Amino acid sequence: PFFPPLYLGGPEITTENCEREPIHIPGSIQPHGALLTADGHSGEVLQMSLNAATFLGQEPTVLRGQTLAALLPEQWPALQAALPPGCPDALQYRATLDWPAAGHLSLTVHRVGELLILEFEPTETGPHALRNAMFALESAPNLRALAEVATQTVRELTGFDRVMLYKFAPDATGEVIAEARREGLHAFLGHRFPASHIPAQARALYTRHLLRLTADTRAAAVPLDPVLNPQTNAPTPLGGAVLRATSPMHMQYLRNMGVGSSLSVSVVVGGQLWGLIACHHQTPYVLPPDLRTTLESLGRLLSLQVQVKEALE
């Protein structure tokens, strides 16, 4: 069971009490994007990240309380129809928007209960990157080859300095069973780590929401304002949002290992977390949203490939 978050009086996290960090409701996002929350019926913007004006151009009073119909006239109908009430919180609506700064602005929306959650992030491969990846994965003759091709493909698509396939045992310990990495990196292949390293609430979350990342492992989180959802007077659930602030405890872990940027995709087999495609980069790194989607798609393929090959082997 969760502690309250730090902003509701909850205690600071330590190595004893880390299984109980409410990692899904940090009340803050990562600084490479902005986030808004809005009413699912009326489209009124209820919360905003304090950096919203940097990405959107409007002010924290000009936005807060306004309707998405007024803010995003072209997207609102399509968005509302894509994410109707009662839908899965994993369902997403994505669109590209123009802004005064060069390039585009990616918008990704999901719904959790009565709330819509809108994530904005800059954008400046595709479906065909994946399509060649599928062939690679499909022709692999055994699980070892599959695991290897999987990590080699992901690294080719992403440029990540380390890409690992991390498989869980029934006791929640994990083993790096395949690894693609930059020449000269110290190898993690075959190493096992304790269950505590990806604690129980994280694993549970990773079964429902299949991709998470830390763009910059020393970047300070940007709070949401107001911190609590006015609909509920409870914390906003950020589990389905990639801009969700990462556990400081995990960021510390990453920095200690010399990791500037991190990303993992879940491999989920029979509704169980089977393992992770776990990636590191030496520097801060923002993976473009369309590459992330591709990775999610690859995770679901690998999950099925694994399920099939494990049944035959």
Ligand X SMILES: *C/C=C1/C(=C/c2[nH]c(/C=C3[NH+]=C(/C=C4\NC(=O)C(C=C)=C4C)C(C)=C\3CCC(=O)O)c(CCC(=O)O)c2C)NC(=O)[C@H]1C
20, 64, 94, 104: which one binds a copy of itself (CB under 8 A): 94
Residue 67 binds what, of ligand X, a copy of itself, none (CB under 5 to 8 Å, by partner type)?
none
**Contact status, residue 139 vs residue 306, Cβ threshold 8 Å:** no
- x/- mask, ligand X, residues 154-193, rule CB under 6 A, reads ----------------------------------x----x
Task: State the minimum distance, in angstroms, from the CB of residue 244 to ligand X.
Answer: 7
Q: Report the residue closest to ligand X, judged by CB.
A: 18
Q: Is 57 left (phi over 0), alpha (psi -120 to 50) or beta?
A: left
18 appears as a binding residue in the annotation: yes
**Contact status, residue 27 vs residue 5, Cβ threshold 8 Å:** yes
Residue 30 binds what, of ligand X, a copy of itself, none (CB under 5 to 8 Å, by partner type)?
none
Our finding on whether 92 is near a copy of itself (CB under 8 A) is: yes
Instruction: List Cα–Cα distances, 99 to 7, 77, 116, 213, in angstroms.
Output: 33, 20, 22, 25
Q: How far apart are CA 80 and CA 67, in angstroms?
A: 12
Nearest in space to 251 (alpha carbons), one of 214, 296, 299, 303:
214
- x/- mask, a copy of itself, residues 101-140, rule CB under 8 A, reads -------------------------xxx-xxx-xx--xx-
Q: Which is nearer to a copy of itself, 16 or 124 (CB)?
A: 124
**Contact status, residue 40 vs residue 115, Cβ threshold 8 Å:** yes
Q: Which residues contact 19 (CB under 8 A, 6 or more apart)?
A: 196, 199, 200, 201
Where along the sequence are the contacts to a copy of itself (CB under 8 A)? 88, 90-92, 94, 126-128, 130-132, 134-135, 138-139, 290, 293-294, 296-297, 300-301, 304-305, 307-308, 311
Binding residues for a tetrapyrrole: 18
